[PDB]
Amino acid sequence: SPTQEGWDLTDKATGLLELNVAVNMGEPDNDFFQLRADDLRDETAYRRRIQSAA
Amino acid sequence: QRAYANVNTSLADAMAVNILNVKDARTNVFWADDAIRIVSQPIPANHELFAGMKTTSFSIPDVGLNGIFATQGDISTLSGLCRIALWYGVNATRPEAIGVGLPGQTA
Amino acid sequence: TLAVDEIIETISAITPMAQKAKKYTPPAASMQRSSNTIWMPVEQE
Amino acid sequence: ENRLESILSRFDADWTASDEARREAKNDLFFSRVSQWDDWLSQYTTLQYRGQFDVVRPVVRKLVSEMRQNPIDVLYRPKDGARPDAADVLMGMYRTDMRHNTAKIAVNIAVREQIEAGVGAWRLVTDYEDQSPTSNNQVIRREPIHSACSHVIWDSNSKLMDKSDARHCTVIHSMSQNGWEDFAEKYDLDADDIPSFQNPNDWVFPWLTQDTIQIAEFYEVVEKKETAFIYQDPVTGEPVSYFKRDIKDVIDDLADSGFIKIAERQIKRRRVYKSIITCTAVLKDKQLIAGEHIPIVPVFGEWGFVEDKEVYEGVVRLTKDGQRLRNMIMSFNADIVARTPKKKPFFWPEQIAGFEHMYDGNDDYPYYLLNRTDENSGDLPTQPLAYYENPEVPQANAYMLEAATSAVKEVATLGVETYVFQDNLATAMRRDGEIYQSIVNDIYDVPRNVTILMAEVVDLATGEKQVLNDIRGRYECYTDVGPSFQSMKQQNRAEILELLGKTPQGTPEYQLLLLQYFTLLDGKGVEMMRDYANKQLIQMG
Secondary structure (H helix, E strand, O other): OOOOOOOOOOOOOOOOOOOOOOOOOOOOEEEEEEEEOOOOOOOHHHHHHHHHHO | OHHHOOOOOOOOOOOOOOOOOOOOOOOEEEOOOOOEEEEEOOOOOOOOOOOOOEEEEEEEOOOOEEEEEEEEEEOOOOEEEEEEEEOEEEEEOOOOOOEEEOOOOOO | OOOOOOOOOOOOOOOOHHHHOOOOOOOHHHHHOOOOOOOOOOOOO | OOHHHHHHHHHHHHHHHOHHHHHHHHHHHHHHHOOOOOOOOOOOOOOOOOOOOOOOHHHHHHHHHHHHOOOOEEEEEEOOOOOOOOOHHHHHHHHHHHOOHHHHHHHHHHHHHHHHOOEEEEEEEEEOOOOOOOEOOEEEEEEEEOOHHHHEEEOOOOOOOOOOOOOEEEEEEEEOHHHHHHHHHHHOOOOOOOOOOOOOOOOOOOOOOOOOEEEEEEEEEEEEEEEEEEEEOOOOOOOEEEOHHHOOOOOOHHHHHOOEEEEEEEEEEEEEEEEEEOOOOEOOOOEEEOOOOOOEEEEEOEEEEOOOOEEEEOOOOOHHHHHHHHHHHHHHHHHHHHOOOOOOEOOOHHHOOOOOOOOOOOOOOOOOOOOOEEOOOEEOOOOOOOEOOOOOOOHHHHHHHHHHHHHHHHHOOOOOOOHHHHHHHHHHHHHHHHHHHHHHHHHOOOOEEOOOOEEOOOEEOOOOOEEOOOOOOOOOEEEEEEOOOOOHHHHHHHHHHHHHOOOOOOHHHHHHHHHHHHOOOOOOHHHHHHHHHHHHHHHHO
């Protein structure tokens, strides 16, 4: 806020100014993989891959 | 408007700029805690991608972020795809509050 | 057109050999990381 | 051969068998609890108006309130030919450990889920309480299960409503990281290796963090013959005790105390084993638990089989179509009201050129003026003024809103009243009583009442641990359903008031009145009345 001194302030009122800033997001960060149905009889590698992805 | 002033004068004609990083140096970084924010959102399951995918949430540890774990299966080739996505953006809302420290900047 | 959906059966197959042959189901994780093969010893002489 | 493979194959068999019913029950829960626009799941749409003008929540609330006004609880009654007070000890124990808030909350949760989706459930567990124990420094409590449709996967080869013929059941628990750490602390698991199982929940609402850690507990019942040892009680008679229950602790202590082994027999009974399992390993294998039945009690709504496939349903399933149609029509009408041009005149610019300020909506002029002449065409053509038509709700929209509302009204009538649902709750309560009786006989110190006083006969091992002794003649009372009472004194007061409500004003009326005074609480005035009543009863003899 500004300020002004004195008793008489005719025509010396001031408006309100509120600035702003913008926020935005980037491209997603991914993990992506493919498996066949014969490779899921163990699942240990699958779970370890999920945790490593996190 | 002058209430927001932050420099004593303005940029006036041929004023020399000085580069302050004159050697390579790993940076030390200080800030006020509210200067860096991380705007994050789970990817909606109605997205054009993740179309035939079954999507659930996925809590990324340590940091307070949640991404999407989406999975799909294929019957022709008895296969499947896993996709872990994370949607976020790091925003510096108070760059005047963020700072950097450059030791050994001998010209 | 008039039509009835009773099936006219035409095949009656029988399975003696695969009924008599014993079925073996080894552990799946072991087969997965052993390339779907398993060894058995042979009676010693 | 692999225990993990066997447990898995069973679980996937049951989980595949119960797919459609579980999906419909979860959709019923979502519809009746969170939102009626199951659109967030997967539809590529925009931001339109979607309002929920509910017409089914009043019915669900009415049903739940009606069934809450009528509490139901187990009631143990002595069998035919047994001692007339054979069930008082069991009833007292049951009231003592089922008067808590946890038991009432479990029953209420199961009832609400039974009304809404079609299936609910609860669990009976045991623990070591050292401040206020029910018996043997132990307490049997009851715990709730939320979303039983997806969280309790019963045996697929079960054709009974209470699942008394089920042989295994897997219960799935999803918890946060701290929840997992405390679970591991409680069950002596390795908290570092985060477990993972079949996720029972679907991310259907814009929740941020739903859940990430899952585990299951596999209960299985085995019916086999085990050795039963016959002894000679040093007081009188011959008691029986299973070999496994005193295999090592007191097997040589009975002889020292005064019990002599008469005979050894084989008796068939059931034992229950729990396995804490994840998707890739077994953490606890076959831990024995108390009782002969699986400690999960299910409650059903409308239950049956279609073709070797289970179908259960509450009240919300058929109202979904009419409710969704009514929501859609009301949203369409709201769009009609919002985005539609209002009624205003159609003008040519030259018809009001220069007079445009008269028509802006003020009230400063006594009339409106229009231009009459055109310099190129002599005169402006004359045509009656036209006004944009007022918005109207289509006859189809009105007819279908009324029709869909009427359809929901006609189909959301459970029964005429919740008699069938309360009868299913009574079936579940009878199952709870059976399970609790088995667990009590396994862990509590049940005395035997002689007609010569209650005889509590037990012995302690060298490790200062008490090993209970219950004779095989334990099932002396059966299970029924009665009103819910918080204590045996309350039950006695209810019985005396009921008897007084049917005895005429004879001498038994005086007797029952004095009895009612005897069974009163204590302040000072009721203390005086009870003292007088006891004196009068003793004097009368």
